[PDB]
């Protein structure tokens, strides 16, 4: 559903690859 | 044609025996691997 993407996709913009 | 069998056969015997003694004297003394393949080739 779009409701999970509107609140989950916002945390994908701030993330450097794991070290 | 028998002299070719004399020289050839005798040479094969000397190479067999003398090369066998060289073999046993080289089995008893990457150098180790070169000994492996020298012994195997003998």
């Amino acid at each position: 559903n779009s409701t999970e993407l509107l609140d989950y996709a916002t945390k994908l913009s701030k993330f450097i690859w794991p070290a | 044609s028998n002299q070719a069998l004399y020289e050839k056969l005798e040479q094969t015997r000397t190479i067999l025996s003398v090369k066998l003694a060289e073999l046993i004297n080289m089995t008893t003394i990457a150098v180790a691997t070169t000994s492996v393949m020298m012994v195997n080739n003998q």
Partner: protein, 138 residues
Amino acid sequence: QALDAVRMRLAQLTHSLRRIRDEMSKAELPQWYTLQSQLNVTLSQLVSVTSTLQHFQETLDSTVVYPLPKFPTTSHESLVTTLLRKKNIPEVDEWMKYVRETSGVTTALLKDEEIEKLLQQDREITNWARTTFRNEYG
């Protein structure tokens, strides 16, 4: 000085092994005289390299080799690590440790302190064997 001949003997090694590759690349195997001859050339090159290598083992261990600023390292870095990799192939070291496990003497006998006597027995049997060969050839 010695590596000037090491590069030539390894060059003849690469040429010989390439010739064996060409002889084995066919459908049916050709004659055996050429195969055994090329194999004898290969063994001659390996022994020839190991002899001079073991002859100059104290000189090569008394120097260090690492590239100069005159080196395109800013573009390629892993290659420079491959050119000076002391680490052996995992197969030679792996089977080397395995053979070390299947040698009849481990580190448990290092704790017992007892190897020079076995070596002495070995050399003694070398003497006995060589004497028996003296007689049997006499």
